Structure formats: C-alpha cells, structure tokens
Coordinates of C-alpha atoms and ligand atoms in Angstrom, one line a residue:
Chain A
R1 CA 0.0 -0.2 -0.5
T2 CA 1.6 3.1 -0.9
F3 CA 1.4 5.9 2.3
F4 CA -1.5 8.7 1.9
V5 CA -1.3 12.2 3.5
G6 CA -4.6 14.6 3.4
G7 CA -4.2 17.5 4.5
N8 CA -7.4 18.8 5.5
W9 CA -7.7 22.6 6.0
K10 CA -10.6 22.8 7.3
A11 CA -12.5 26.1 7.3
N12 CA -9.0 27.8 7.0
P13 CA -7.6 30.2 5.8
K14 CA -9.6 33.1 5.8
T15 CA -8.9 34.9 2.7
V16 CA -7.3 33.4 -1.4
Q17 CA -4.9 35.9 -0.8
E18 CA -3.6 33.3 2.7
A19 CA -4.9 30.1 -0.2
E20 CA -2.7 30.9 -2.7
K21 CA 0.0 31.6 -0.7
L22 CA 0.1 28.1 1.4
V23 CA -0.2 26.5 -2.7
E24 CA 3.5 28.2 -3.4
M25 CA 4.6 27.0 -0.4
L26 CA 3.6 23.6 -0.6
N27 CA 5.0 23.7 -4.3
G28 CA 8.2 24.6 -2.8
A29 CA 8.6 21.3 -1.0
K30 CA 10.6 18.4 -1.3
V31 CA 8.5 15.3 -1.0
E32 CA 11.3 12.0 -0.4
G33 CA 9.9 8.7 -0.4
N34 CA 6.8 7.3 -1.9
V35 CA 3.3 8.9 -0.7
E36 CA 0.7 9.9 -2.1
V37 CA -0.8 13.2 -1.3
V38 CA -4.3 14.3 -1.1
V39 CA -4.7 18.6 -0.1
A40 CA -8.8 19.4 0.6
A41 CA -10.1 22.9 0.8
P42 CA -13.4 25.0 1.4
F43 CA -15.1 24.9 -1.5
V44 CA -14.1 28.7 -2.4
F45 CA -10.3 28.0 -3.0
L46 CA -11.3 25.0 -5.1
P47 CA -10.7 26.4 -8.2
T48 CA -7.5 28.6 -6.5
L49 CA -5.8 25.3 -5.7
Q50 CA -6.7 23.7 -9.1
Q51 CA -4.8 25.7 -11.1
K52 CA -2.2 26.2 -8.9
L53 CA -0.4 23.6 -7.2
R54 CA 1.6 21.2 -7.7
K55 CA 0.0 18.3 -10.8
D56 CA 1.9 15.9 -8.7
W57 CA -0.6 16.7 -5.6
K58 CA -4.3 16.1 -5.9
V59 CA -7.0 19.1 -4.5
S60 CA -10.3 17.4 -2.6
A61 CA -14.0 19.1 -1.4
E62 CA -14.1 19.0 2.2
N63 CA -18.0 17.1 1.6
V64 CA -20.3 17.2 -1.1
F65 CA -23.9 16.8 -0.8
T66 CA -25.7 13.3 -2.4
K67 CA -27.0 14.2 -5.4
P68 CA -26.1 15.9 -8.7
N69 CA -28.0 19.0 -8.5
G70 CA -31.1 20.6 -7.6
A71 CA -33.5 22.6 -4.5
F72 CA -30.2 22.1 -2.2
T73 CA -29.6 26.1 -1.6
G74 CA -26.0 26.1 -0.2
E75 CA -24.4 22.2 -1.5
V76 CA -21.7 22.2 -3.4
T77 CA -22.4 18.9 -6.0
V78 CA -20.1 16.2 -7.1
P79 CA -20.7 16.8 -10.6
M80 CA -19.5 20.4 -9.5
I81 CA -16.8 19.3 -8.0
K82 CA -15.1 16.7 -11.2
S83 CA -16.3 19.5 -13.5
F84 CA -12.5 21.6 -12.5
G85 CA -10.7 18.1 -12.9
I86 CA -10.9 18.1 -9.0
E87 CA -10.8 14.2 -8.3
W88 CA -11.3 14.2 -4.2
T89 CA -13.7 14.2 -1.6
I90 CA -13.9 14.1 2.3
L91 CA -16.6 12.4 4.1
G92 CA -17.7 12.1 6.8
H93 CA -15.3 14.5 9.0
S94 CA -16.6 14.2 13.4
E95 CA -16.9 18.2 12.0
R96 CA -19.8 17.0 10.0
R97 CA -21.3 15.0 11.8
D98 CA -21.9 16.8 15.4
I99 CA -21.4 20.3 14.6
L100 CA -23.2 19.7 11.3
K101 CA -25.6 16.9 12.4
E102 CA -24.4 14.0 9.9
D103 CA -25.5 10.6 9.8
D104 CA -25.0 7.5 8.4
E105 CA -27.4 7.4 7.1
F106 CA -26.5 10.3 4.8
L107 CA -23.0 9.8 5.3
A108 CA -23.3 6.3 2.9
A109 CA -25.8 8.2 0.3
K110 CA -22.2 10.4 -0.7
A111 CA -20.1 7.3 -0.4
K112 CA -22.2 5.7 -2.8
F113 CA -22.8 8.9 -5.6
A114 CA -18.8 10.2 -5.1
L115 CA -18.0 6.4 -5.9
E116 CA -20.7 5.4 -8.6
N117 CA -19.6 9.0 -10.4
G118 CA -16.0 8.8 -10.4
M119 CA -14.8 10.4 -7.0
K120 CA -12.6 9.2 -4.4
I121 CA -13.0 9.0 -1.2
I122 CA -11.6 10.0 2.4
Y123 CA -14.4 8.7 4.8
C124 CA -13.5 8.9 8.1
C125 CA -14.8 7.6 11.3
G126 CA -14.3 6.8 14.5
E127 CA -15.6 6.7 18.9
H128 CA -16.6 10.0 21.7
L129 CA -15.3 9.4 25.1
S130 CA -18.2 7.6 26.9
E131 CA -17.8 4.3 23.8
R132 CA -13.8 4.5 24.5
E133 CA -14.2 4.8 28.4
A134 CA -17.1 2.1 28.3
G135 CA -13.5 -0.6 25.9
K136 CA -16.5 -0.5 23.4
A137 CA -14.6 1.2 20.8
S138 CA -14.5 -1.3 18.4
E139 CA -18.6 -1.9 18.0
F140 CA -18.9 1.6 18.7
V141 CA -16.6 2.2 15.0
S142 CA -17.6 -1.2 13.1
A143 CA -20.8 -0.1 13.6
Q144 CA -20.2 2.8 11.7
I145 CA -18.1 0.6 9.0
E146 CA -20.8 -2.0 8.3
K147 CA -22.8 1.4 7.4
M148 CA -20.2 2.4 5.0
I149 CA -19.7 -1.1 3.4
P150 CA -23.1 -1.3 1.2
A151 CA -22.2 1.5 0.0
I152 CA -19.1 1.0 -1.8
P153 CA -19.9 0.2 -5.2
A154 CA -18.4 -3.4 -6.8
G155 CA -14.1 -2.4 -8.1
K156 CA -15.0 1.1 -6.3
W157 CA -12.5 0.0 -3.6
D158 CA -9.3 1.4 -5.1
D159 CA -10.9 4.2 -4.4
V160 CA -11.8 4.4 -0.4
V161 CA -9.3 5.1 1.8
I162 CA -10.7 5.7 6.4
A163 CA -10.1 7.9 8.7
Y164 CA -10.0 6.6 12.2
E165 CA -10.3 10.1 13.8
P166 CA -9.7 9.6 18.4
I167 CA -12.4 11.6 18.5
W168 CA -12.0 10.9 22.1
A169 CA -9.4 13.0 21.9
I170 CA -10.6 15.7 20.8
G171 CA -11.7 19.1 23.3
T172 CA -12.1 16.2 25.6
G173 CA -9.2 16.6 28.2
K174 CA -7.9 13.1 27.1
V175 CA -5.1 11.9 24.7
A176 CA -4.0 9.3 21.8
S177 CA -1.2 7.8 21.7
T178 CA 0.9 6.1 19.0
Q179 CA -0.2 2.7 20.4
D180 CA -3.8 3.8 20.9
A181 CA -3.4 5.0 16.7
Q182 CA -2.5 1.4 16.0
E183 CA -4.5 -0.3 18.1
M184 CA -8.1 1.5 15.8
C185 CA -6.1 0.7 12.2
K186 CA -5.9 -2.4 12.8
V187 CA -9.4 -2.7 14.6
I188 CA -10.6 -1.8 11.1
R189 CA -8.4 -3.8 8.6
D190 CA -9.5 -6.4 10.5
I191 CA -13.6 -6.2 10.8
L192 CA -12.8 -5.2 6.2
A193 CA -11.3 -8.0 6.6
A194 CA -13.6 -10.4 8.1
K195 CA -16.7 -7.9 6.6
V196 CA -14.9 -7.9 2.4
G197 CA -11.9 -10.1 2.5
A198 CA -8.1 -9.8 2.8
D199 CA -8.6 -8.5 -0.3
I200 CA -10.0 -5.3 0.0
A201 CA -7.9 -5.4 3.5
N202 CA -4.5 -5.7 2.4
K203 CA -5.3 -2.8 -0.2
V204 CA -7.8 -0.3 1.8
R205 CA -4.8 2.8 3.3
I206 CA -6.8 3.6 7.3
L207 CA -5.4 6.8 7.8
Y208 CA -5.8 8.2 11.4
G209 CA -6.8 11.2 12.2
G210 CA -6.5 12.2 15.2
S211 CA -3.7 15.0 16.6
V212 CA -0.1 14.6 13.7
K213 CA 2.4 17.5 13.9
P214 CA 6.2 16.5 13.3
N215 CA 6.7 16.1 17.0
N216 CA 4.8 12.1 16.9
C217 CA 4.5 12.4 12.8
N218 CA 7.5 9.2 12.5
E219 CA 6.7 7.2 15.2
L220 CA 3.3 7.2 14.2
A221 CA 3.5 5.9 10.7
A222 CA 5.8 3.1 11.7
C223 CA 3.2 1.2 12.9
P224 CA 2.0 -1.3 10.8
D225 CA -1.6 -0.4 10.1
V226 CA -1.2 3.3 10.1
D227 CA -0.9 3.8 6.0
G228 CA -1.2 7.8 6.4
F229 CA -2.8 10.6 8.0
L230 CA -5.8 13.0 7.9
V231 CA -4.1 16.3 9.5
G232 CA -5.8 19.5 10.6
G233 CA -3.5 22.3 11.7
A234 CA -0.4 20.7 10.5
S235 CA -1.8 21.5 7.3
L236 CA -1.7 24.9 7.7
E237 CA 2.1 25.0 8.2
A238 CA 5.2 24.6 7.0
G239 CA 5.1 21.3 9.3
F240 CA 2.3 19.7 6.8
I241 CA 6.5 18.7 4.6
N242 CA 7.0 16.1 7.5
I243 CA 4.5 14.8 8.4
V244 CA 4.5 13.9 4.3
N245 CA 7.8 12.8 4.7
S246 CA 6.8 10.5 7.3
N247 CA 6.3 7.4 4.9
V248 CA 9.6 6.7 5.1
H249 CA 9.6 5.5 8.6
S250 CA 6.4 2.6 7.8
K251 CA 7.5 -0.1 6.0
Chain B
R1 CA -37.3 50.7 -1.7
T2 CA -35.7 50.3 -5.6
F3 CA -37.0 47.1 -6.6
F4 CA -34.7 43.9 -6.1
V5 CA -34.0 40.8 -7.9
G6 CA -32.3 38.0 -6.6
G7 CA -31.3 34.9 -9.1
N8 CA -31.2 31.5 -6.6
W9 CA -29.6 29.5 -8.7
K10 CA -29.3 25.9 -5.5
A11 CA -27.4 23.8 -6.4
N12 CA -27.6 23.8 -10.5
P13 CA -25.8 24.1 -12.9
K14 CA -23.7 20.7 -13.1
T15 CA -20.7 22.4 -14.9
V16 CA -18.3 25.4 -14.3
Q17 CA -18.0 25.2 -17.8
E18 CA -22.5 26.2 -18.2
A19 CA -21.4 28.5 -15.5
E20 CA -20.0 30.5 -17.5
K21 CA -22.3 30.9 -20.6
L22 CA -24.8 31.4 -18.0
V23 CA -23.2 34.3 -16.9
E24 CA -22.6 35.5 -20.4
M25 CA -26.2 34.8 -21.3
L26 CA -27.0 37.5 -17.8
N27 CA -24.1 40.0 -19.2
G28 CA -26.1 41.2 -22.6
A29 CA -29.6 41.1 -21.3
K30 CA -30.7 44.4 -21.3
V31 CA -32.0 46.0 -17.7
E32 CA -35.4 48.4 -17.6
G33 CA -37.0 50.3 -15.3
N34 CA -34.6 50.9 -12.4
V35 CA -33.2 47.2 -10.2
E36 CA -31.3 45.9 -8.8
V37 CA -29.7 42.7 -9.0
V38 CA -28.4 40.2 -7.6
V39 CA -27.3 36.7 -8.3
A40 CA -26.5 33.7 -6.3
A41 CA -24.4 30.8 -7.3
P42 CA -22.9 27.5 -5.5
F43 CA -19.4 28.1 -3.2
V44 CA -17.4 27.0 -6.7
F45 CA -18.4 29.4 -8.9
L46 CA -18.4 31.9 -7.3
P47 CA -15.1 33.0 -8.3
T48 CA -16.1 32.4 -12.0
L49 CA -18.9 34.6 -11.2
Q50 CA -17.0 37.2 -9.9
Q51 CA -15.1 37.4 -12.4
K52 CA -17.0 37.6 -14.8
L53 CA -20.3 38.9 -13.8
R54 CA -21.2 42.2 -15.6
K55 CA -20.3 44.5 -12.5
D56 CA -23.6 45.9 -12.0
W57 CA -25.3 42.6 -10.5
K58 CA -23.8 41.2 -7.4
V59 CA -22.9 37.7 -5.9
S60 CA -24.3 36.4 -3.6
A61 CA -23.2 33.3 -2.0
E62 CA -25.8 30.6 -0.9
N63 CA -25.1 30.7 2.6
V64 CA -22.3 31.3 5.1
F65 CA -20.9 29.5 8.5
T66 CA -21.1 31.8 11.6
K67 CA -18.0 32.5 12.6
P68 CA -14.4 33.5 10.9
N69 CA -12.7 30.0 9.7
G70 CA -11.5 27.3 12.2
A71 CA -12.3 23.3 12.8
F72 CA -15.3 22.8 10.7
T73 CA -14.5 20.4 8.0
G74 CA -16.2 21.1 4.9
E75 CA -18.4 25.3 6.1
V76 CA -17.3 27.9 3.9
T77 CA -16.8 31.4 6.5
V78 CA -17.9 35.8 5.6
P79 CA -14.1 36.0 5.6
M80 CA -13.5 34.0 2.0
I81 CA -16.2 35.0 0.4
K82 CA -15.4 38.4 1.1
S83 CA -11.7 38.4 0.6
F84 CA -13.2 37.8 -3.4
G85 CA -15.1 40.7 -3.6
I86 CA -18.2 39.1 -2.8
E87 CA -20.5 41.4 -1.0
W88 CA -24.5 39.3 0.2
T89 CA -25.5 35.5 0.6
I90 CA -28.7 34.4 2.0
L91 CA -29.3 33.1 5.1
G92 CA -32.3 30.9 6.1
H93 CA -33.6 29.6 3.1
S94 CA -36.2 27.1 3.1
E95 CA -34.5 23.9 1.9
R96 CA -31.2 24.4 4.5
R97 CA -33.8 25.5 7.0
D98 CA -35.8 21.7 6.2
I99 CA -32.9 19.5 4.0
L100 CA -30.5 20.8 6.1
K101 CA -31.9 20.6 9.4
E102 CA -31.0 25.2 9.9
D103 CA -32.7 26.2 13.1
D104 CA -32.7 29.7 14.4
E105 CA -31.0 30.0 16.6
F106 CA -27.9 29.0 13.9
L107 CA -29.2 31.5 11.4
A108 CA -29.6 34.2 13.7
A109 CA -26.2 33.7 14.5
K110 CA -25.6 33.5 10.8
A111 CA -27.5 37.3 10.3
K112 CA -25.1 38.8 12.9
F113 CA -21.7 37.5 12.3
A114 CA -22.3 37.8 8.6
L115 CA -23.8 41.6 9.5
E116 CA -21.4 42.6 11.9
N117 CA -18.2 41.7 9.1
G118 CA -19.7 43.9 6.1
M119 CA -22.2 41.6 5.1
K120 CA -25.4 42.1 3.1
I121 CA -27.4 39.1 3.5
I122 CA -30.9 37.6 1.8
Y123 CA -33.4 36.5 4.9
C124 CA -35.1 33.7 4.0
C125 CA -39.0 33.2 6.0
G126 CA -41.7 30.9 5.6
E127 CA -45.2 29.2 7.4
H128 CA -45.3 25.3 6.0
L129 CA -48.6 23.9 5.0
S130 CA -50.1 23.0 8.4
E131 CA -49.9 26.3 9.6
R132 CA -51.6 27.6 7.0
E133 CA -54.2 25.4 6.9
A134 CA -54.5 26.6 10.2
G135 CA -54.9 30.0 9.8
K136 CA -51.7 30.2 11.3
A137 CA -48.9 32.7 9.2
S138 CA -48.6 35.1 10.5
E139 CA -48.5 33.6 14.2
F140 CA -45.8 31.4 12.7
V141 CA -43.5 34.4 10.2
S142 CA -43.6 36.5 13.6
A143 CA -41.7 34.0 15.2
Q144 CA -38.9 33.7 13.1
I145 CA -39.0 37.6 12.1
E146 CA -38.6 37.8 16.4
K147 CA -35.8 35.3 16.7
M148 CA -33.9 37.7 13.3
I149 CA -34.4 41.1 15.0
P150 CA -32.9 41.1 17.2
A151 CA -29.5 40.1 14.8
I152 CA -29.4 42.3 13.1
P153 CA -27.1 45.0 14.0
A154 CA -27.7 48.8 15.0
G155 CA -27.1 51.0 11.9
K156 CA -28.1 47.0 9.6
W157 CA -30.8 46.9 8.0
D158 CA -30.2 49.0 5.1
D159 CA -28.0 45.8 4.5
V160 CA -30.9 43.4 5.1
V161 CA -33.6 41.8 2.5
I162 CA -36.4 39.9 3.6
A163 CA -37.5 37.6 2.0
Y164 CA -41.4 34.9 2.1
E165 CA -41.5 31.6 1.0
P166 CA -44.3 30.4 0.9
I167 CA -44.2 26.2 1.8
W168 CA -46.7 26.0 2.3
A169 CA -46.9 25.6 -1.5
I170 CA -43.8 23.9 -2.4
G171 CA -44.0 19.6 -3.5
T172 CA -47.1 20.5 -1.3
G173 CA -50.3 19.7 -3.9
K174 CA -51.6 24.3 -2.8
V175 CA -50.3 26.5 -5.0
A176 CA -49.7 30.0 -4.3
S177 CA -52.4 33.3 -5.3
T178 CA -50.8 36.8 -6.5
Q179 CA -53.0 38.4 -3.4
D180 CA -51.5 34.4 -1.1
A181 CA -48.0 36.7 -1.4
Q182 CA -49.0 40.5 -1.2
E183 CA -50.4 40.1 2.1
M184 CA -47.9 38.2 3.7
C185 CA -45.5 40.7 1.9
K186 CA -47.8 43.1 4.5
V187 CA -47.5 40.7 7.3
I188 CA -43.3 41.2 8.0
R189 CA -43.9 44.9 6.9
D190 CA -46.8 45.1 9.4
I191 CA -44.6 42.9 12.5
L192 CA -41.3 45.5 11.4
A193 CA -43.6 48.9 11.6
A194 CA -44.5 47.4 15.3
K195 CA -41.4 46.5 15.7
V196 CA -38.5 47.7 15.2
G197 CA -40.9 50.8 14.2
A198 CA -42.0 52.7 10.3
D199 CA -38.9 54.0 9.9
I200 CA -36.8 50.6 9.0
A201 CA -40.1 49.1 7.6
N202 CA -40.7 51.8 4.6
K203 CA -37.1 50.8 3.8
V204 CA -36.8 47.4 3.5
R205 CA -37.2 45.0 0.6
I206 CA -39.9 42.3 1.3
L207 CA -39.2 40.1 -2.1
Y208 CA -41.8 36.5 -2.6
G209 CA -39.4 34.2 -3.0
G210 CA -42.8 31.0 -4.0
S211 CA -43.3 30.2 -7.8
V212 CA -41.9 33.0 -10.1
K213 CA -41.5 32.9 -14.1
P214 CA -42.3 35.0 -16.7
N215 CA -45.6 34.0 -15.9
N216 CA -46.5 35.8 -13.1
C217 CA -44.1 38.0 -12.3
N218 CA -45.4 41.3 -13.4
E219 CA -49.2 40.5 -11.8
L220 CA -46.7 40.0 -8.9
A221 CA -44.3 43.1 -9.3
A222 CA -47.3 45.0 -8.8
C223 CA -48.6 44.6 -5.4
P224 CA -48.2 47.5 -3.3
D225 CA -45.5 45.3 -0.4
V226 CA -44.2 43.3 -2.6
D227 CA -40.7 44.8 -3.7
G228 CA -39.4 42.4 -5.6
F229 CA -38.8 37.9 -5.8
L230 CA -36.2 35.8 -4.9
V231 CA -36.3 33.4 -8.4
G232 CA -35.8 29.6 -8.6
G233 CA -35.5 27.8 -11.5
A234 CA -36.0 30.7 -13.6
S235 CA -33.0 31.8 -13.2
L236 CA -31.1 30.2 -14.4
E237 CA -33.2 30.5 -18.2
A238 CA -33.9 33.8 -20.3
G239 CA -36.4 34.2 -18.5
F240 CA -34.4 35.5 -15.5
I241 CA -34.7 38.7 -17.3
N242 CA -38.4 39.5 -18.2
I243 CA -38.4 38.6 -14.1
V244 CA -36.2 41.4 -13.6
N245 CA -37.9 43.7 -15.7
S246 CA -40.6 43.4 -13.7
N247 CA -40.1 46.5 -11.5
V248 CA -41.5 49.1 -14.0
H249 CA -44.9 47.2 -13.0
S250 CA -43.9 48.2 -9.5
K251 CA -44.9 52.0 -8.5
Ligands
NA301 NA1 2.7 2.5 8.8
NA302 NA1 -44.4 46.0 -5.8

C-alpha cells in the first residue's frame, strides 16, 4: 500500500490571498520517499488550488451533497467539483457528523453517489469519549464501517481511503497514544477483512486522523496498520512536509 | 425602495462550463427600469461569477457559517467570500432549514456575524402547510422574524433584505395566489413596523420567494408590499430577465 497523507485545511485560511500563499509554499516542498498527497480546502478556494497546486498532488473537497444538482440551496455537488478536474472528497468528518449533524444514512448515500460518479473518497469514522471509556471503541467503529460497506460499489475499493478520528481525544482533556492509533487502524483493517475479505483489507489505506504534528508523525507512521494521516492544523504550516515525509518510516 | 431581484441558482448548474455560459447570457441582458440584481450560485462557481459577471449586478453566496474560520470541515465563512469581493449571502432558505436542519438560533447567529462583518443578507422565512391550513401563517412568520430582529446590529438594516417563501406551496399540491404573496409581504412589513419602527419597515425590501416565472412576475411585482423576488428555477433561464424587468410594474 502506498502511504497516503491528506492535508485537511478545514475552514481555513480566511482569504484566497492566504490560500494562494500556502499553495506557493507547498509547491516548493521537497518530498522524500513514496507518498500520495491530497490537499483539501474550502469550496471557494478549490478552483485556485486546482489551477495552482503542484500537479503531482491532488486537490480534495471537504464535503459534497448526495445528488447531482437541484433544489439544495447552499450545497455543492460531485459534478460541480469534477467539472474543475477535482478527483477527491472527504466524507463524514467528525466536525460534520457532530456540528452539522450528518448521520450514517446521509454519509452512506454520499459515499455511494460519489464513487458511482468517479470520485475517490476519504471516509472518516471514530468513537466518542463514552464509548472509549466503556471499552466499546471497536463495536462503535464497526457499526460505522458496517454502514459504509454496502455503499461501496463493486470494484470501487481502489478509490476508498478510511480515516480514523479519535473523537474521544478531541476537546475532551484526554490524549491519544501512538499505540491507540495503531490499535484502531488494525481494528478497522480486521473489520474489513471479516466483512469484505483479505484482498480488500490488504489494499485499503487506513489513516490516523487524530493530532498529527512534526513531533509525532514519524513514530505514528512506523505503526504497521497506520497507512498515513488526515492532518488538521499542521496542514496549514511548513510542518506539513515533515508529515508527508514521515512515509520513509513506514515499512 | 428600489425593486430587488435575486436569482438563486440553488445547486445548479452541474458544471463550471455551464455556469460560464449562463453568465455570458446574463451579461447581454437588457435591463429596463430601476432594479437591484443579485445572482447567487454554488460556492465553487463564486470565483468565476465574481470575475465574469456584469459589474452592475452583484454576486451572492447561498449560505455561510457562523465563524470567521476554524475547525468546521466543509463550511465556507464570511471572510473567505469577502476575500473575492463578494458582498451578499442568502441565509435561512427553506431548503437549508428543512433538509440541512438549520434552526433559528443557528440562523440568527449567521445573520449577526455576517452583518457585523460587512455583508448584506437575504434572510428567508415562511410557513409550512400545517400553519397555512390552520390560519396561523402570520404567527409562525412573526416568530421567525422575531428571532431575526435581535441579530440585526444597530445601523445595519440598510443591508437586510427579507424573502418570504410559501413553503406550504412547495411540493404540497397547493398553489399560491398573487393575493397570497401580497398578504404575507404586508404581514412581514407590519411585524417590522410594530417591532423596530416605521422607518425601518419603510426601507426594508421584502421579496416574494415562491414560484416566480415570466407568466406571473408582472402581476406579482405590482403588489404594493412585494419589493421584488428571490427567483428559483427561472434564474437559470432566459426568462430571468423578464423577471428582472417586472420592476416597471411596481410603483
Ligand atoms: Na505505517
Ligand atoms: Na411591488
């Protein structure tokens, strides 16, 4: 499996002028090793990223709707993204599940529609504090993945990347260890193996989407079931390249 | 009050190439009378609209979030829009209230943040079938407007336009009359007069945001409390200019 690093800018930066400066920074970055890099940005910055970002990396949307077009004021759809040549979207990020109240049914429908229409997806999952403390993390994550599975069209697993978010470690006063990251990525791989088979489980990249910074990326990358990262705040900083380059520590 | 016509493209068209063709069509349109025209489009098409649309009209977003930036994956914020020179946003469209579950608290916070940050807003309201049938339309609409009022900063009413959507006539098997449109726009004007005073009530444009087409725009425009339209499907068609030009029938 090729190591995979997505930079999720989230709702940043504030201005297109800043977005352009970030792209200029990324374009000069020297990548070591072998790694697939995707950069996700706010919708209004996607055209300028697609035009200006180094072509060995790919641009990603941060969300899409379930339909091709129509009476859905405020929503952006897959065909609109594709019309710019953009190939990726994030789906099911914790922030959308929690703040924007996106449920699994909505997310499954997005995954199916996106894949049927030629997109590649970074599909996010992860358990909250209660389930972590109860020792029921695998059960919760399995239920999420089990909702996602039927959405994936036959022959589309090549176009799926899964990101694990330790939501129990986001704004809770608890922190995740490297071991925690490894354990949950392995949990996901095993769910895939049990439900859709070893061939799929062996090719699907499973990312760690908790806090990833230059000070912990190498140790995390070395974990055997961690295939890369969905990076938050560091994606806006010069440290992003350190994280991209942590691939050399992943065997 | 200057007649006001917003074209809400909603989640259309499917491609940036189609968006560009639409802009070319709009740019050649001959406007008669005196009218303020705003065109709202999907986020990913906003940059090309801002660059290419005739400069006597203004571009609008179809939604914005409540914060300047941050950990809100998928969301677009006011500063991002403004960085392109875009001055307008729609807020509280029925489709977002209903499909995306946006509540009045969320919408009030958007209105306040947007106005504080120099945006102009088209704020949408309107009652559903139950309330229409119960003869409780004014009560429902008043509650919505009463939630909006405290959000409007002092001195910002010049930058507010309100759109009435007869949601009771959208996908219900019932249709709205011209008289219905007039009555509800008057209802809103009277709520403003009672709550924030005649001066504000007299300057705020109140739009009809039900079905507006070339075959009914002139009669609707002539209604005394109807100050313009938030146009749906016709905004994607050559008929949009007929609607823009209905201003000559509004005294
Ligand atoms: Na690894
Ligand atoms: Na009128």
